[PDB]
Design an enzyme around this catalytic site. Structure first.
Site, short mmCIF file in Angstrom:
data_model
loop_
_atom_site.label_atom_id
_atom_site.label_comp_id
_atom_site.label_asym_id
_atom_site.label_seq_id
_atom_site.Cartn_x
_atom_site.Cartn_y
_atom_site.Cartn_z
N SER A 255 16.12 1.35 1.24
CA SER A 255 16.13 2.79 1.41
C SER A 255 17.57 3.28 1.31
CB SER A 255 15.53 3.18 2.77
OG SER A 255 15.70 4.55 3.04
N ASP B 87 -3.02 -6.09 4.38
CA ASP B 87 -1.71 -6.34 4.96
C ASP B 87 -0.69 -6.70 3.87
OD1 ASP B 87 0.45 -6.95 6.49
OD2 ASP B 87 -0.38 -8.84 7.30
#
Length: 330
Positions: A199, A35
């Protein structure tokens, strides 16, 4: 040193991935959920409340000659999906894919929430976010990656998640045969303890690319792609019959639909998520309403590049003094 381990979807929807991990002496092999969105290595154990164990493999520290109680240490964690676990702490030897760390904090669960109990395939979590998020008290502990870093050939790990197929986590090296083209690296902020990056935008299907900054986290422990409501609305508007359902808890679409791809920007590069990756199947057994793999982050408080996005790429988690993230197509 290096390590290399295969990671395998837990079910037919790629809801999560498990990777075998050797703990203790002699080795006890548990299948852990790696994770990159948390920083605790915790396991089902001989100390876990018996009624909360249902099919998991447990770590038994009393059977390990290298286990030592970390005196006074406790831990307690709550995840974004509302699940939780807590317990005490041992140090022990932990190996992943041939890479061994001695003195790793192994957090033994005394209590786990229902979602963990109900998932027989996940024996615990191995956190790979920054150690500043680790929940051990009163002495915060380091992640497996942080402990291994100095010994690694290169201070990196890579995630290569499969679509309905096994993939690989590598530690200490970049497998140049595992991706196509070049790797594009992008800046990381560690301010919130995550692999947080920005992004450069998105496209829906064959549509034009929209240049827009989207701050979010690379999180292998989250199944879906959670993005701003504006982006998600633009995506689902291209699917006939798709709608946001408060009763179901997100966007659903007719199972008869063919989904468009979704592209996200990494610097000047582009990662394309095929439409099939966005199909999470019937909302309930036999239903013709299917659950979407792209959902709104509104009211999560953060955008999350979960498995839906990450499995479309070869992803480099660069833990150099100034961390960065790399993405390549594959």
């Amino acid at each position: 040193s290096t390590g290399s381990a295969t990671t395998t979807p837990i079910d037919s929807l790629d809801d999560a991935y498990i990777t075998p991990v050797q703990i203790g002496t002699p080795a006890q092999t548990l299948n852990l959920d790696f994770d990159t969105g948390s920083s605790d290595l915790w396991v089902f154990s001989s100390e876990t409340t018996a009624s909360e164990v249902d099919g998991q493999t447990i770590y038994t520290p009393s059977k390990s000659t290298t286990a030592k109680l970390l005196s006074g240490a406790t831990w307690s964690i709550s995840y974004g999906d509302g699940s939780s676990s807590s317990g005490d702490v041992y140090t022990d030897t932990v190996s992943v894919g041939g890479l061994t760390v001695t003195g790793q904090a192994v957090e033994s669960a005394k209590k786990v929430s229902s979602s963990f109990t109900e998932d027989s395939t996940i024996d615990g979590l191995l956190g790979l976010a920054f150690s500043t998020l680790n929940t051990v008290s009163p002495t915060q502990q380091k992640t497996f990656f942080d402990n291994a870093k100095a010994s690694l050939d290169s201070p990196v790990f890579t995630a290569d998640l499969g679509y309905h197929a096994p993939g690989t986590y590598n530690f200490g090296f970049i497998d140049t045969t595992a991706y196509t083209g070049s790797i594009t690296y992008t800046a990381v902020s560690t301010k919130q303890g995550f692999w947080e990056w920005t992004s450069t935008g998105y496209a829906v299907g064959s549509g034009t690319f929209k240049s827009t900054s989207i701050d979010g986290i690379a999180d292998t422990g989250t199944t879906l792609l959670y993005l701003p409501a504006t982006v998600v609305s633009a995506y689902w508007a291209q699917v006939s019959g798709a709608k946001s359902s408060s009763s179901v808890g997100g966007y659903v679409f007719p199972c008869s639909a063919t989904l468009p791809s979704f592209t996200f920007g990494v610097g000047s590069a582009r990662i394309v998520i095929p439409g099939d990756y966005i199909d999470f199947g019937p909302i309930s057994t036999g239903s013709s309403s299917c659950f979407g793999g792209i959902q709104s982050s509104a009211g999560i408080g953060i955008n999350i590049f979960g498995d839906v996005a990450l499995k479309a790429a070869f992803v480099v988690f660069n833990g150099a003094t100034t961390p960065t993230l790399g993405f390549a197509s594959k």
